[PDB]
Design an enzyme around this catalytic site. Structure first.
Site, PDB file in Angstrom:
ATOM      1  CG  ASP A  35       0.588 -12.404 -11.442  1.00  0.00           C
ATOM      2  OD1 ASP A  35       0.164 -11.396 -12.064  1.00  0.00           O
ATOM      3  OD2 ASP A  35       1.507 -12.333 -10.586  1.00  0.00           O
ATOM      4  CB  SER A 199      -4.515   2.964 -22.886  1.00  0.00           C
ATOM      5  OG  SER A 199      -5.809   3.518 -23.013  1.00  0.00           O
TER       6      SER A 199
HETATM    7  N1  LIG Z   1       0.912  -9.146 -10.622  1.00  0.00           N
HETATM    8  C1  LIG Z   1       2.381  -8.928 -10.556  1.00  0.00           C
HETATM    9  C2  LIG Z   1       2.726  -7.465 -10.490  1.00  0.00           C
HETATM   10  C3  LIG Z   1       3.497  -6.865 -11.472  1.00  0.00           C
HETATM   11  C4  LIG Z   1       3.751  -5.504 -11.434  1.00  0.00           C
HETATM   12  C5  LIG Z   1       3.237  -4.724 -10.411  1.00  0.00           C
HETATM   13  C6  LIG Z   1       2.463  -5.312  -9.421  1.00  0.00           C
HETATM   14  N2  LIG Z   1       1.837  -4.545  -8.408  1.00  0.00           N
HETATM   15  C7  LIG Z   1       2.263  -3.376  -7.873  1.00  0.00           C
HETATM   16  O1  LIG Z   1       3.330  -2.848  -8.165  1.00  0.00           O
HETATM   17  C8  LIG Z   1       1.341  -2.751  -6.876  1.00  0.00           C
HETATM   18  C9  LIG Z   1       1.826  -1.851  -5.935  1.00  0.00           C
HETATM   19  C10 LIG Z   1       0.972  -1.233  -5.038  1.00  0.00           C
HETATM   20  C11 LIG Z   1      -0.358  -1.534  -5.106  1.00  0.00           C
HETATM   21  F1  LIG Z   1      -1.211  -0.914  -4.239  1.00  0.00           F
HETATM   22  C12 LIG Z   1      -0.885  -2.412  -6.011  1.00  0.00           C
HETATM   23  C13 LIG Z   1      -0.019  -3.024  -6.902  1.00  0.00           C
HETATM   24  C14 LIG Z   1       2.213  -6.679  -9.462  1.00  0.00           C
END
Ligand SMILES: NCc1cccc(NC(=O)c2ccc(F)cc2)c1
Length: 330
Positions: A35, A199
């Site tokens: 991740d 981007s």
């Molecule tokens: N992988 C670590 C990490 C870091 C920053 C943000 C997220 N993800 C989100 O904020 C999120 C919220 C709603 C969704 F439908 C999908 C994703 C995850």
């Protein structure tokens, strides 16, 4: 030193990718979700509440001769998607694809939220964002990459995620056979602890490229591509019958559609996401409404270049003194 490990989709939709990780002595192999959007290495364990374990492989520190309790240390994380986990901390030997770190903080879950329990294929997460985000208290801990960095031949790791197929995470070297053309590097801000970059714009299908700055994070731990509502509307407007559904939670489209590609800019370069990568299949079994792989970031607070975008590229996470990101077509 270097390491190289294969990463495999957990299901037919590429909802996430798992990579085998050896923990402890003798090794206990757990399949972790690498991740780049978080900074904790945490695992299902012999300490996890039994009702919250459902098929995962667990780490048992008492069976590892190299495990040591990190006395007094706890951790607790709430991810942007609403999931969470917490527990205590051991140090142990951790190896990824032949690259070994001794004394790595291995965060043992005592509690995990339901979405983790319900995913039997993911035994934990291995964070690869900046260590400033690590949640261990009272002594913050370093990521696996940060601990390995000084020993690596080059202070980099690469993500080469497959579309409906396995891919590769490499540490310490750039496999010049794994991409076409050249790698375009772009600046990173670490101020929020993420691999955050800008981007240079986008195109929908064969349409003209719109030059516009889109700040977002390169996040292997997020499945989809989350972009500003304007960009996402322009994409789905090219798909007959696509609409944003509040009841489903995002854009849906007729499963009979052929989706257009989506291009994003990296400096003067362009990465093309084929339309098929944007199909996440029926919203529920048997439905003819399909879930889109490009969704609005409105309400998240950040744009997220998740797996839908990253799997279209060979991506370099350059952890030099001034970090940068590199993208190549492949
Ligand atoms: N992988 C670590 C990490 C870091 C920053 C943000 C997220 N993800 C989100 O904020 C999120 C919220 C709603 C969704 F439908 C999908 C994703 C995850």
């Amino acid at each position: 030193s270097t390491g190289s490990a294969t990463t495999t989709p957990i299901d037919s939709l590429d909802d996430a990718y798992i990579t085998p990780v050896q923990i402890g002595t003798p090794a206990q192999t757990l399949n972790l979700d690498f991740d780049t959007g978080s900074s904790d290495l945490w695992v299902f364990s012999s300490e996890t509440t039994a009702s919250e374990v459902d098929g995962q492989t667990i780490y048992t520190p008492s069976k590892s001769t190299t495990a040591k309790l990190l006395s007094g240390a706890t951790w607790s994380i709430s991810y942007g998607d609403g999931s969470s986990s917490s527990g205590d901390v051991y140090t142990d030997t951790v190896s990824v694809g032949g690259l070994t770190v001794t004394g790595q903080a291995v965060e043992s879950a005592k509690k995990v939220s339901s979405s983790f329990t319900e995913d039997s294929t993911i035994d934990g997460l291995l964070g690869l964002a900046f260590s400033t985000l690590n949640t261990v208290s009272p002594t913050q801990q370093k990521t696996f990459f940060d601990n390995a960095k000084a020993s690596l031949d080059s202070p980099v790791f690469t993500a080469d995620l497959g579309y409906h197929a396995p891919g590769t995470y490499n540490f310490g070297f750039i496999d010049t056979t794994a991409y076409t053309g050249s790698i375009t590097y772009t600046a990173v801000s670490t101020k929020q602890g993420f691999w955050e970059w800008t981007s240079t714009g986008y195109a929908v299908g064969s349409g003209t490229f719109k030059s516009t700055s889109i700040d977002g994070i390169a996040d292997t731990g997020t499945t989809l591509l989350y972009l500003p509502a304007t960009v996402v509307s322009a994409y789905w407007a090219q798909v007959s019958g696509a609409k944003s559904s509040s009841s489903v939670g995002g854009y849906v489209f007729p499963c009979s559609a052929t989706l257009p590609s989506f291009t994003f800019g990296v400096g003067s370069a362009r990465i093309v996401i084929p339309g098929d990568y944007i199909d996440f299949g029926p919203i529920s079994t048997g439905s003819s409404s399909c879930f889109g792989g490009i969704q609005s970031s409105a309400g998240i607070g950040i744009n997220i270049f998740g797996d839908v975008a990253l799997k279209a590229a060979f991506v370099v996470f350059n952890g030099a003194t001034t970090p940068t990101l590199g993208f190549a077509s492949k």
